[PDB]
């Protein structure tokens, strides 16, 4: 009923994990299981040291995740997908970095294909040119927008096979 409620923080189905009984209970149970597994081995064992490391990892994970939101019923940390950047466990940062990396891969590849234009080069990679294109693909956003704008990205559909014939010729 208010613009303030638009944020995922002000929702009745979620709560901060550090204040969530279910989250606390789940972690407490995980820690108990790890400690019980550790107790089986001898005190000075390498496996004992590894279990101490794992217990430390669990405690640090609990501390780090305490800030994230999680549902009241189950108390598991949630991922925010509304588009709010300044929120813990936001999907935008991983989304943006992955989109950049994936566009990098696609651009590099398309550029190698355009530069080579040969099945022989497709089979036996021209490793120098391939590495050059991989390095060059870092400016892919600007390069791709410029090519789209200037008409060097897409070719008219009349230049490519449309598909099967659906009518009489």
């Amino acid at each position: 009923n208010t613009p303030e409620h638009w944020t995922i923080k002000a929702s009745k189905r979620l709560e901060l994990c550090k204040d969530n009984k279910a989250y606390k209970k789940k972690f407490k149970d995980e820690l108990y299981k790890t400690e019980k597994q550790q107790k089986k081995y001898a005190t000075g064992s390498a496996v004992y040291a590894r279990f101490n490391k794992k217990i430390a990892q669990i405690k640090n994970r609990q501390e780090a995740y305490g800030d994230r939101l999680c549902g009241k019923q189950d108390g598991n940390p949630r991922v925010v997908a509304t588009g709010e950047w300044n929120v813990r466990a936001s999907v935008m940062w991983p989304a943006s970095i992955f989109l950049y990396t994936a566009g990098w891969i696609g651009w590099a590849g398309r550029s190698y294909l355009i530069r080579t234009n040969d099945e022989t080069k497709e089979l036996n990679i021209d490793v120098p040119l391939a590495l050059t294109c991989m390095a060059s693909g870092f400016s892919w956003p600007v390069a791709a927008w410029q090519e789209i704008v200037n008409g060097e990205m897409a070719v008219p559909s009349s230049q490519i096979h449309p598909g099967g014939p659906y009518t009489q010729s």
Partner: protein, 194 residues
């Protein structure tokens, strides 16, 4: 023809004509594989960034801007610094990078068509002081390259000394220093086996 630096290896033929190549040293043939113009541009860039980086690495441990909480271990200064000011540094670096190369920033775009006639490392910055005589100009270019390479190695050494000591740079051996044996502690294959 054996390379001067490595008299047991063939002389590289594609790196000629550049300052600082007196001891022709390309054992892995990188100049053969890629364009020496791009390689030299990258080498200059690394040298300049690294010599500025060494000076800043030394300075930050003592002197900081008003405010700007300090970090004796200069490796942690990135985290301790104001994020907005660090982003300003990144913004200025990006502006300079884009403007200097006009938009031909990539391995293919740069040194292609127009801009190929540009010297590998020349960004037309502070060229008023370049001596007219070619001998002195080449000597100055070699001095720049030598200082840059030494700065690259020095910055690597600074960072890794900070990592091993887990402390500030200037005291080379902290109080009670016994050796760097315990720094690389994460389990390895042979280490775990033995």
């Amino acid at each position: 023809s054996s390379s001067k630096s490595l008299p047991f290896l063939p002389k590289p033929q594609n790196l000629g004509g550049l300052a600082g190549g007196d001891a022709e040293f390309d054992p892995l043939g990188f100049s053969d594989t890629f364009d020496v113009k791009w390689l030299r541009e990258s080498e200059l860039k690394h040298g300049r960034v690294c010599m500025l980086a060494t000076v800043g690495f030394v300075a930050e441990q003592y002197i900081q801007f008003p405010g700007f909480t300090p970090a004796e271990d200069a490796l942690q200064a990135i985290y301790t610094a104001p994020p907005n000011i660090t982003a300003l540094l990144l913004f200025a670096c990006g502006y300079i990078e884009s403007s200097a190369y006009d938009g031909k920033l990539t391995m293919l775009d740069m040194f292609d068509g127009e801009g190929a006639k540009r010297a590998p490392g020349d960004l037309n910055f502070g060229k008023r002081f370049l001596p007219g005589d070619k001998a002195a100009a080449d000597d100055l270019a070699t001095k720049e390259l030598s200082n840059g390479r030494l700065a690259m190695l020095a910055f690597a050494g600074m960072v890794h000394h900070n990592l091993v000591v887990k402390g500030p740079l200037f005291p080379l051996f902290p109080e009670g220093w016994a050796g760097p044996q315990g720094s690389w502690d994460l389990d390895s294959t042979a280490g775990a086996l033995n």
